[PDB]
Amino acid sequence: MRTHSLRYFRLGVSDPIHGVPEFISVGYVDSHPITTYDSVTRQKEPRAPWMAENLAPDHWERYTQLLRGWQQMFKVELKRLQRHYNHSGSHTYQRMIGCELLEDGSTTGFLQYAYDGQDFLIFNKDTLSWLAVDNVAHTIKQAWEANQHELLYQKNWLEEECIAWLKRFLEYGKDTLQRTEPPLVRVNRKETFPGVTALFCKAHGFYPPEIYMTWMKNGEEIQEIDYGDILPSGDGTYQAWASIELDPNLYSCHVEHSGVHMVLQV
Amino acid sequence: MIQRTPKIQVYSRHPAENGKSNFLNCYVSGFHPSDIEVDLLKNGERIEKVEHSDLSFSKDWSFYLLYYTEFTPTEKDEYACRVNHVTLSQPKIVKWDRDM
Amino acid sequence: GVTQTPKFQVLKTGQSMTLQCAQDMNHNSMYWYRQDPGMGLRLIYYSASEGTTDKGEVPNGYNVSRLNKREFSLRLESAAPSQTSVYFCASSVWTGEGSGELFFGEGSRLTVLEDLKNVFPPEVAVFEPSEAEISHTQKATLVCLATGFYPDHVELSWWVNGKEVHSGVCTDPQPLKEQPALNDSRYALSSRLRVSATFWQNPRNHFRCQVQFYGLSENDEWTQDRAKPVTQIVSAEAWGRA
Amino acid sequence: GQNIDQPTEMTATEGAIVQINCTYQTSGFNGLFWYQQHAGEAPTFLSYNVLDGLEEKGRFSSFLSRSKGYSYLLLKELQMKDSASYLCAVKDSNYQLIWGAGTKLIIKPDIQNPDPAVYQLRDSKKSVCLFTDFDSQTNVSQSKDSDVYITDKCVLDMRSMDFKSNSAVAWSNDFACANAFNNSIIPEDTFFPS
DSSP states (O other), X not given: OXXXXXXXXXXXXXXXXXXXXXXXXXXXXXXXXXXXXXXXXXXXXXXXXXXXXXXXXXXXXXXXXXXXXXXXXXXXXXXXXXXXXXXXXXXXXXXXXXXXXXXXXXXXXXEEEEETTEEEEEEETTTTEEEESSXXXXXXXXXXXXXXXXXXXXXXXXXXIHHHHHHHHHHHTHHHHSOOBOOEEEEEEEEOSXXXXXXXXXXXXXXXXXXXXXXXXXXXXXXXXXXXXXXXOSSSOEEEEEEEEOOOOOEEEEEEETTEEEEEEO | OOOBOOEEEEEESSXXXXXXXXXXXXXXXXXXXXOOEEEEEETTEEOSXXXXXXXXXXXXXXXXXXXXXXXXXXXXXXXXXXXXXXXXXXXEEEEOOTTO | OEEEEOSEEEEETTOOEEEEEEEOSOOOEEEEEEEOTTSOOEEEEEEEETTEEEEOSOOTXXXXXXXXXXXXXXXXXXXXXXXXXXXXXXXXXXXXXXXXXXXXXXXXXXXXXXXXXXXXXOEEEEEOOOHHHHHHHSXXXXXXXXXXXXXXXXXXXXXXXXXXXXXXXXXXXXXXXXXXXXXXXXXXXXXXXXXXXXXHHOTTOEEEEEEEEOOBOTTSOOOSSSOOOBSEEEEEEEEOXX | XXXXXXXXXXXXXXXXXXXXXXXXXOSSOOOEEEEEEOTTXXXXXXXXXXSSEEEEETTEEEEEETTTTEEEEEEOSOOGGGOEEEEEEEEOTTSOEEXXXXXXXXXXOOOSSOOOEEEEEEBOOOEEEEEESOOTTOOOOOOSSSSEEEOOOEEEXXXXXXXXXXXXXXXXXXXXXXTXXXXXXXXXXXXXXX
């Protein structure tokens, strides 16, 4: 197994312009959406076929009721936050919780809040304490840190429950999440502005999206490499690239994907 | 507050060749807040038959979306992606670089 | 914290009824449980927050209404003898917060009967301490007996000179069946008040045994020639003597 | 989850210690709660454990091993007061509470000077026999004629005098206190006055 992850996001919007839910929730395994809920449908629904086929209807019924509750919690906290800040009008409140299971056997877990899309409160499950970015966050910090049992509960959830959900969903979606589609890599040479040769090394067709690409001179490290984003091709695979300039030493593109290494010599 | 204007990237599913059927993606990312309008244009005009993912969430609290459509590139046809967002005075039309 | 009504209710089969529950703790979540001998609490219905409800483990024959943030009603559509039980309302700050405890109301005892023809208030009698006990132990025991009542809906208490007393008192945990062979046996209950021999010999000291019975309300139909077994207090008293 | 297991009933002596066990086998774990419920009253929250160890609140302590799926409620310096049922409950992976059927804890007084006797009491207007002041090892048995009625043991506490005593009651409407508790095994030096 490669590194895998489970993440749940919440998004609250006070005073939303028509057509924007006041509350949206979405879970992910790796890059794949698995679950969704919002304040318009007021239902938690699967977003992936392997989630729908493996989780009985009483699962979605139970989490429908909790998200309804959690939407009301988010509405009320946003109101208090705005009161602390003395903010009128429309503002956003966000939460991310999740965990990772890396190849190493070692795990991670995290829990974070943002207000207006900036860091607000960061939980440390190893010291069981919240980090506050300012004095309003410091007030909430004191409230949450005074409930000792609640911090122990979060630590337990990140370290045991979250990892066990992830292992469950990996088995459900293993045919999607554990597969490998290797990349197609090509190198393109071209003289650009007079006397400037750009080399592009370009990859597509691959999955998982994680991929390593770099340029090397004579077999040792490279100058300034330009990196293209890993982008979804819309068919379940990904694409990316890396480029350098030379002018006229000989170069090679090096690609790493799912434990297979590739060299393209220019 | 702090609003982030969207990054807009237009690219084909496969290496593009004039006359071979392909897919045109528009990936709209890094923006905040979440309200956004995206359309794909053929020679200035909205393509009606356009798929898109749901709104997605990044660890940095911004959002991203993928819009795409089936298309056959030609020398004549000029494709673009048009995006509107509160950071934008008017809609930004971003022209496909033709897989250059 | 949580207020629940009524404490006791007799119902005929096929009658309907609503249990009320109110909490003013700004809690978001409320629950209706039934407790039956020899098994864990069973959740009937719940309301994770205002504006939503869902079935629990044993919803059949019930429904609920989360009227507002404070109130969560439970209805018995058509009372069945199987719904004879003790019902607990409970609330909690949220649902899905791992460490939040439940806050329970006091309980509602409900008995469903085919008819009300066997409902009887208790008879109560107090029995003065033995003369042999007084001089052999320098202590004096009063015995109270509530006999012949049905259903088992009684609360018994001792009152010395106006104040309810708890020291020197013990009431039987369970009633006993006067006709153990009979499906609708009536019940007897005993309680013991023990005081010093000096106390009992003090003629100014007043001993009162009291049994709150919970039976029918003013608005129940009664046809029989015998008196209507309404909710009532039955008592017997004793005066100290030397 | 599926199962919570805790003993039906437990008896221990006043002034000693007792441990009420609770094993759980659930699908996911989000906390173990202990509640106390007095006879005829509502449960009330005692303790919450979610990580391994022992939390102590006064004379009460609650322990959890998450790997053995196991908790106990520990009660030190037992008092009569402590008689009640104790409810074990586990939150599962979907935050549902699975409740154990409860453990009834009975506290036996430590009888200082037993004085077993059977007395007769007259109505203040019918006759009642009172077995009383026997050691906490004596166990009374119910009636056979069904026209006689006999209650179970009951412990009373005269708090001003630190005096606990047991008692059982019997009555009928051909019946005498000499024969009353014959079906139970009474002490050999029980007092039967004239």
